[PDB]
Design an enzyme around this catalytic site. Structure first.
Site, PDB file in Angstrom:
ATOM      1  N   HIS C  55       0.817  -1.207   0.000  1.00 29.02           N
ATOM      2  CA  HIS C  55       0.000   0.000   0.000  1.00 29.02           C
ATOM      3  C   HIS C  55       0.854   1.261   0.000  1.00 29.02           C
ATOM      4  CE1 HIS C  55      -2.927  -3.006   1.690  1.00 29.02           C
ATOM      5  NE2 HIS C  55      -3.637  -2.471   0.711  1.00 29.02           N
ATOM      6  N   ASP C  85       0.264  -8.309   1.304  1.00 32.24           N
ATOM      7  CA  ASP C  85       0.538  -6.884   1.521  1.00 32.24           C
ATOM      8  C   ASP C  85       2.039  -6.557   1.472  1.00 32.24           C
ATOM      9  OD1 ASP C  85      -0.342  -4.296   1.766  1.00 32.24           O
ATOM     10  OD2 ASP C  85      -0.666  -4.389   3.944  1.00 32.24           O
ATOM     11  N   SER C 153       4.896   0.703   8.512  1.00 30.65           N
ATOM     12  CA  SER C 153       4.635  -0.395   7.579  1.00 30.65           C
ATOM     13  C   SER C 153       5.859  -0.697   6.733  1.00 30.65           C
ATOM     14  CB  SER C 153       3.471  -0.057   6.651  1.00 30.65           C
ATOM     15  OG  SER C 153       2.335   0.336   7.390  1.00 30.65           O
TER      16      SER C 153
END
EC number: 3.4.21.107
Lengths: 206, 205, 204
Positions: C55, C85, C153
């Site tokens: 993302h 992800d 992240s």
């Protein structure tokens, strides 16, 4: 049985540093003469003379500044002078029986990863100890704090922790807690103890 | 050739204490059972007596208890104390039960490392680390009490009734509902108090 | 008082000095030129491959990677995985890079002390400490109460030896009664992550 083993503990740090972290109270004046509690934070006793470092924002516009030690003594504190540049402030108290002072190792160099304890008075619950590590020791480039010399830590910090102490596992002063970044988690800051000692000395002579 | 350096770990305390902390579910009738509230609980001895929080099992048609080894039992309410917000359950199992390690002579110190063990947001057993922030208060304070353990080990909904242990796995207290946007501020009933309360419930009711 | 001059402060600085140099700041730039999104990444091997968040890099015009030693590189997108992800970047390996320490025979245990390393709120590389709260979380995930924020992240979760335990993803977001979850974050286990990377590299 574990009856003979020793629980892992930072109690040695608490017994060394905690007695010198005080509760600071900013008292205003109620519309309906009597004095009420406007703001509250933490503070730290640096030496026997009775000097105490704390946050400027905690003491600003205070009719009466009250300082409470953990041994139950309560003093009225005089405002020695604040710093517009570093958000610190120095108080003074007149005690008779001697004072507890924060341990300071001027030769100790804080490293990223060091275990630290925050000591202060969150939400007026009474003195609280939280545990974290030093996340950063200043920044070289431009960053959201606008400064280059802040200690960052993930030891939980709340309203009331300001002007309190950040010590390592030995109970040695690493810095003075300021404010907490605000839905952030585990992000708080402290003024390095080296810099805080200089600001204090300056505010005292001046 | 490959050296045996080992990473810092509170896994010993986990292997000792964790098996005895259970997920407590509260069931209701819609005319078919379904979950209304959930929490944690602690197995205190071989007989199968369990401590949990009172509010967790309030007005429950069926109390279910899940151990970490995959066993699931139906539990019976033995007693509850509103003053201390503690409740006691009872399960009947065939084999042996994992019990929480207790050291009646150990004294919790401010600064001790502690692990909170419970079932937050029903994610399965979660373990979070912190220290003892305080061991009660002498003065009048916002909690209204004088004997709460305060800890900064993360506590979330579903942690109530669960165990706070030290690095040895020894029970320090039972976590209760925690405290605009506070960070690292949770509470537990002292283990000594909790045990006494439990004994009264078992015989007196 | 007492002389702690010769006492030694409890510290995880060994872990920092070993793993941190390999955790980079990832910047998703967009035309408008500017920074659209930002996260963290981990340099896996000397070939210049980096793991990060899918993302963080989605819909990027120019992906930039910033090492802690001051160097800044332009990363090309090798491929991302819909299911996990994770995304893989590639930079110029010429000159030598810092790599994350990996112990392929180390088993994470619940209770292990871990450090998260990433770039929360673009404050610069930040180190936070917690423990492995759980393993094999299906919604395999490691759980950890090492504070995670937006920006973490694609960064590293390492133990006190500095060995990689997993790649950080997002935190828990579901508010029971209008409240904010605390100390609940997740990380792709390092075993699984490595496989995903190898496969993405291979499929590209």
């Amino acid at each position: 049985d574990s009856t003979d083993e020793t629980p892992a503990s930072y109690n040695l740090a608490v017994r060394r540093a905690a007695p010198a972290v005080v509760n600071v109270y900013n008292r205003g004046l109620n519309t309906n003469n009597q004095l009420e509690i406007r703001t509250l934070g933490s503070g730290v006793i640096m030496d026997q003379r009775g000097y105490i470092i704390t946050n400027k924002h905690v003491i600003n516009d205070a009719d009466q500044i009250i300082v409470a030690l953990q041994d139950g003594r309560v003093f009225e504190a005089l405002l020695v002078g604040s710093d517009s540049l570093t958000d610190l402030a120095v108080l003074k108290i007149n005690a008779t029986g001697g004072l507890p002072t924060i341990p300071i190792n001027a030769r100790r160099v804080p490293h990223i990863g060091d275990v630290v304890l925050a000591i202060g008075n969150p939400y007026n619950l009474g003195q609280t100890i939280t545990q974290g590590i030093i996340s950063a020791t200043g920044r070289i480039g431009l960053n959201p704090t606008g400064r280059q010399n802040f200690l960052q830590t993930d030891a939980s910090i709340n309203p009331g922790n300001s002007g309190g102490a950040l010590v390592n596992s030995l109970g040695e002063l690493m810095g003075i807690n300021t404010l907490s970044f605000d839905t952030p988690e585990g992000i708080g800051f402290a003024i390095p103890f080296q810099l805080a000692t200089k600001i204090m000395d300056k505010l005292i002579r001046d």
